[PDB]
Amino acid sequence: SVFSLTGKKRQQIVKQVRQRYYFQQLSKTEQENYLTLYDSLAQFREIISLTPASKKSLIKTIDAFVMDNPEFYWITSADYRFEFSDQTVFVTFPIPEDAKNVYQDLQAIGNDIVANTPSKDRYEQVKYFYEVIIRDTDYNKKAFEAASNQDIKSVFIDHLSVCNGYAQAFQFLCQKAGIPVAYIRGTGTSQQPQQSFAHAWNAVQINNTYYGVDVTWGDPVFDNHLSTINYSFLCLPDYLMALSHQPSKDIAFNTKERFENVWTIPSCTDDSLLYSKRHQSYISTFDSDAILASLENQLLNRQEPLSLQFAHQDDYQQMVTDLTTNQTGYHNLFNQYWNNYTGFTYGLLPETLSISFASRN
Ligand code: NA
Numbered sequence: 001s002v003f004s005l006t007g008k009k010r011q012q013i014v015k016q017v018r019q020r021y022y023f024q025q026l027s028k029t030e031q032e033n034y035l036t037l038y039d040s041l042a043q044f045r046e047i048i049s050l051t052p053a054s055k056k057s058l059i060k061t062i063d064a065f066v067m068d069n070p071e072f073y074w075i076t077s078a079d080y081r082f083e084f085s086d087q088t089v090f091v092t093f094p095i096p097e098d099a100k101n102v103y104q105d106l107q108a109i110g111n112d113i114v115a116n117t118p119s120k121d122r123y124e125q126v127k128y129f130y131e132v133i134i135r136d137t138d139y140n141k142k143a144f145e146a147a148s149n150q151d152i153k154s155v156f157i158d159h160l161s162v163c164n165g166y167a168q169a170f171q172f173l174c175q176k177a178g179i180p181v182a183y184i185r186g187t188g189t190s191q192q193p194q195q196s197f198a199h200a201w202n203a204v205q206i207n208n209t210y211y212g213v214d215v216t217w218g219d220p221v222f223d224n225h226l227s228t229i230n231y232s233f234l235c236l237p238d239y240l241m242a243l244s245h246q247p248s249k250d251i252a253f254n255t256k257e258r259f260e261n262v263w264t265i266p267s268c269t270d271d272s273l274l275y276s277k278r279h280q281s282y283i284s285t286f287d288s289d290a291i292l293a294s295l296e297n298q299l300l301n302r303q304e305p306l307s308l309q310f311a312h313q314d315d316y317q318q319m320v321t322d323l324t325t326n327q328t329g330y331h332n333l334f335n336q337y338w339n340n341y342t343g344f345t346y347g348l349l350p351e352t353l354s355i356s357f358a359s360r361n
Contacts, residue, residue: 001051003088005035013038019175021182022064025264029053030061037065041072041093044100050082050089058082058089059253060262067183070152070168071175073106074099077150077164080253102153106172109156114176122179122206123235123273129173130215130234137161137169139221144197163188163216167200170215180205182266186247190223191350201245203266204235210266211235211273214245217351225349231275232309232352238268243313244351276309276354283308286315288322292333295357299337310353319355320348334359 005013013035017023023034033050040048050058062080070076075093082091096102113132117125138160143149154161155169167183174181181204188199201214214233216222223230247265252258276282281294291308298306310316323330323346334357335341343360 001032003036003049003051004032005039009039010035017068019178019180020064020068021180021266022068022263026061026064027057030057030064033058033061034065037061037091038069041069041075044095044103046092046095048091048093050091052084052087052089056259058091059251059259062091063251063253063262067185068171070172070183071103071106073102073151073153076152076168077147102157106152106156110172110176113173117177122177122204125177125179126174126204126206126211126213127231127234129170129177130213130218130231131229132173133166133169133215134219134229137166137219139166139216139219141221163222164200166216166219167202167214170202170213174202174204182210184247184265186245188217189244189246189351191244192225192348199245201233203268205266206235206273209270210268211270212238212241212245212266212268214241217244223349223351226305226307226347226354226356230349232349232354234275235273236268236352237271237274239311240271240274240352241268243353271311274309276307281307281309282311283315283319284311286310286318288329291319292329295330296333299333304338304358306357308355313353316350316353316355323355330357 017038023031026034029051036050037048059080066075074095078093082089117128119125133155136159137155140149140160140162144162148154149162150164152165152169152172154165171181171183181202183200184203185200187196189196203210203212213235218230218233220228220230249261249263249265250258251262271277274282280297283291283294294308295306310319330344334344338359345358345360347356
């Protein structure tokens with residue numbers, strides 16, 4: 001095809017996209033068009049000429065490209081618009097007038113964040129990116145409770161964003177760091193009160209296995225039940241993430257239609273990177289002794305607030321019931337370590353089977 005990349009430019013683009021997530025699920029012709037899309041958007045073209053395929057194949061290619069490539073911030077929330085003509089498919093992404101300088105503004109910010117990570121351990125880098133986005137970005141709760149908040153410009157330029165921007169910003173940084181990463185879209189479900197909502201989050205590959213990451217839900221303005229940085233959404237297995245997340249495999253390419261069950265979602269099975277597990281606050285079996293010992297170990301390290309995360313729903317629920325009835329074990333322990341003790345308060349985040357404790361005032 002005349003639109004396929006060639007020469008040195010092709011080599012450069014092949015290297016650039018090799019780790020992109022949805023790219024891996026595209027066929028040969030679709031990957032060629034993906035490469036052409038990358039080159040043309042990197043030249044800041046509004047209209048891209050692609051080689052003809054079925055309507056579905058083109059939508060798959062475009063959808064994969066948009067999810068995979070936050071750097072082209074102007075495409076992240078755009079409609080999928082294309083037209084067939086004379087053995088060519090013309091794809092249009094309206095492009096802002098300042099797109100080149102904003103694109104390079106974001107490159108400089110991203111490069112600075114990645115280059116100065118304190119550790120080069122991949123987990124520590126992922127944790128650092130989580131922290132950076134949460135600390136430096138205001139969550140736009142007014143917007144949620146109701147575009148322009150959906151891309152990495154809203155995160156790194158405006159510092160005011162919603163889940164789609166957070167998740168694309170996390171991918172943006174991971175890509176620059178060379179960490180395989182995915183953007184995942186779907187449905188979040190919160191409790192107290194029960195509620196479902198459109199949502200976006202991430203997966204990362206560390207040590208050749210995937211881990212779930214939800215930066216947005218770790219933001220205290222998004223959810224303050226444990227209030228701060230809520231680490232209980234950092235590198236989760238699916239048996240915990242699935243309690244509040246349902247990823248979508250579908251492509252809704254307009255308001256009336258979709259393609260069902262197109263994409264494969266990363267499988268996250270390892271719990272070894274849980275913050276709670278790494279800090280000896282993960283309870284995998286209901287046991288009063290083990291619960292109090294974990295809290296006492298935290299108290300011996302002079303931590304406040306204390307925290308617990310459970311592996312299994314019914315164990316978390318039994319702990320909740322014991323806190324509404326048998327509280328004596330807890331007062332006896334806390335009174336030993338907290339001065340002027342007059343009780344304790346607790347916060348519940350059932351979405352990750354988590355609880356936090358603090359001295360009452
Ligand atoms: Na924030």
